[PDB]
């Protein structure tokens, strides 16, 4: 796997904050052959999070397959606990003065320091306790954003979904109209993106696509959360996999809010357009091309297989929609598979899914099957009558035995 197109400089510049290190370690431990760029980036920026035990373990494993600076770690620990104690003293004197602004600033700096150091649970509990002491709308929205981000870091999306819903519903029913499709600040877009990411991680692709499609490019970039390219990719793939033709045309193809978003991903734009206009061979070919890069993502790697299977099944069902008698050779050519593989896939689809057809393996032709209602209703009604008569006879016998008091005793 030799990939020159994946530029680490822009990939790092797209994000900021804590998420950078987990993203880099994920791509590093799932993708070899990045020695020079990985070494340069690690040497220049590995100094954060003050956590190098697993890092040194992994690099020792890498070196043995193909250290601890006591003074540096002591200095980092010393200044970290020194500033922690200083923030404790500031919090103490602020709570002694008993000023709402002072204590709010105190919790803000404590949360920032906890985020920098790596402790999350204590910050989350502190913020939950401090929620009752926050009364302004701006302050409560800020604490909602903070709890959302720490929950996203901690990977508990079911718990954070309630927070997103409460933050959406609390301020005058989502600002009533929405403040002329959001105001200058991008807060509704952040809520929508967080909810979409949570829905995607919870395996609700339709909801994830519906949440991410409402994101507006006016938000520019969100370095803590997912990148604009990432939200474009997620909202394109989920929409392609779940939305039907009418919904896709109404919400993605024609909507004048997601096209400029897809302009960052020409590959995804071409994929969705070719799927819409029935160029299945090219669409599937470029999907298979993009799969290798997609597998190295963070929140989409588990769902790649399911999304691709759903997309391919949707394409197969939509190909046979206008036809009453299709030739399997052309279908196999258009789906980049042999006739035998296409026959097996068609059998699997006909057995359970939406395709109602019968294969003919002599001439290799798929014939649409039209079921007559009259015979089916007659058959089902006669079967129901037979079952009813049997049950009535059985319960008549049950009534007889119950009346006669027949039962099995211990001896």
């Amino acid at each position: 796997v030799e990939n020159p197109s994946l530029d680490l400089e822009q990939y790092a510049a797209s994000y900021s904050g804590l998420m950078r290190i987990e993203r880099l370690q994920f791509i590093a431990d799932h993708c070899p052959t990045l020695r020079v760029e990985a070494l340069k980036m690690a040497l220049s920026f590995v100094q954060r999070t003050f956590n190098v035990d697993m890092y040194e373990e992994i690099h020792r494993k890498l070196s043995e397959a193909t250290a601890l600076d006591t003074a540096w770690v002591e200095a980092t620990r010393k200044k970290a606990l020194l500033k922690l104690e200083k923030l404790d003293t500031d919090l103490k004197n602020y709570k002694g003065n008993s000023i709402k602004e002072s204590i709010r600033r105190g919790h803000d700096d404590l949360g920032d320091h906890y985020l920098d150091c790596g402790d999350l649970s204590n910050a989350l509990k502190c913020y939950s306790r401090a929620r009752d002491y926050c009364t302004s709308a701006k302050h409560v929205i800020n604490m909602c954003l903070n709890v959302i981000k720490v929950s996203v870091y901690l990977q508990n999306w079911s718990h954070v979904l309630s927070y997103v819903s409460k933050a959406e519903s609390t301020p005058e029913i989502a600002e009533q109209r929405g403040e002329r499709d959001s105001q200058t600040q991008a807060i509704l877009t952040k809520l929508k993106c967080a909810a979409g990411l949570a829905e995607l991680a919870a395996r609700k692709y339709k909801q994830a696509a519906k949440c991410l499609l409402l994101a507006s490019f006016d938000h520019c970039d969100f370095p803590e959360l997912l990148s604009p390219s990432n939200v474009a990719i997620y909202g394109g793939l989920c929409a392609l996999a779940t939305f039907d033709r009418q919904e896709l045309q109404r919400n993605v193809i024609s909507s004048s809010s997601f096209k400029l978003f897809l302009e960052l991903e020409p590959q995804v734009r071409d994929i969705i357009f070719k799927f819409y206009e029935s160029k299945y061979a090219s669409c599937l070919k470029m999907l298979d091309e993009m799969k290798d890069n997609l597998l190295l993502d963070m929140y989409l790697a588990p769902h790649v297989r399911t999304l691709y299977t759903q997309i391919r099944n949707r394409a197969l069902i939509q190909y046979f929609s206008p036809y009453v008698s299709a030739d399997m050779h052309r279908m196999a050519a258009a789906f980049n598979t042999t006739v035998a593989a296409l026959e097996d896939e068609l059998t699997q689809l006909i057995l359970e899914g939406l395709i109602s057809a019968r294969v003919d393996s002599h001439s290799k032709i798929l014939y649409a099957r039209d079921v007559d209602q009259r015979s089916t209703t007659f058959e089902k009604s006669l079967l129901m009558g037979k079952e009813f008569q049997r049950r009535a006879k059985a319960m008549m016998l049950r009534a007889a035995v119950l009346r006669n008091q027949i039962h099995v005793k211990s001896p």
Partner: protein, 213 residues
């Protein structure tokens, strides 16, 4: 209008370059109305864009309402737009194609007309196909190709696109290269009602039997 003018001209320029559906369409109508109210001497080249927008919306269908434009239109130097409108409203492909290929140095050289001529040519073909398909029950695809003056593959692609869009009610037989349109209607409501009655009877019988214990 230091900020508003720059913002609106930028929106106009990327909407001309790309054309994001309805938003670009509304921007085009507003800009054309502005250039009609203010840019009076530019009508000589603005009329082509006006009639093009008229055939894109296909709702106003009154490009000849302005009686002042007729004396200047009857001049034979510029009549391709008018004969295109007349052919497009009449919904005939042969006249449109003959005028398009015969007329020179007026239409095919302008990128702002070339990029939108495809939908213009496809709309009349779609409408003619829909009108043609009405009486027949099983109609050959080569016959449609002969009528619409396109190859067989183009006819099949157009039929597939129309059927998926629920504008043509029928299904294509690929082996025999035809399409069959559903014209017969049966009384399926009676059988649906019988199915519902059977299911309700089954559930009710199960509950009544299970009552005794």
């Amino acid at each position: 209008p230091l900020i508003m003018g720059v913002i609106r001209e930028c929106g106009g320029k990327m909407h001309l370059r790309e054309g994001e559906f309805e938003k670009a369409h509304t921007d085009f109508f507003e800009a054309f109305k502005n250039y009609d109210e203010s840019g009076s001497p530019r009508r000589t080249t603005c009329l082509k864009y006006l009639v093009l927008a008229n055939m894109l919306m296909k709702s106003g269908i009154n490009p000849f309402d302005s009686q002042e434009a007729k004396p200047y239109k009857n001049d034979p130097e510029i009549l391709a737009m008018t004969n295109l409108v007349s052919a497009y409203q009449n919904n005939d492909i042969t006249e449109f194609e003959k005028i398009l290929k015969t007329n020179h140095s007026n239409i095919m050289d302008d990128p702002f007309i070339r990029e939108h001529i495809e939908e213009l040519l496809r709309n009349i073909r779609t409408q003619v196909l829909i009108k043609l398909i009405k009486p027949y029950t099983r109609i050959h695809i080569p016959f449609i190709s002969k009528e619409l003056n396109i190859d067989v593959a183009d006819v099949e692609s157009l039929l597939v696109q129309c059927i998926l869009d629920n504008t043509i009610h029928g299904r294509i037989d690929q082996v025999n290269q035809l399409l069959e349109l559903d014209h017969q209607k049966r009384g399926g409501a009676r059988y649906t009602a019988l199915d519902k009655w059977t299911n309700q009877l089954n559930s009710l019988n199960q509950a009544v039997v299970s009552k005794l214990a």
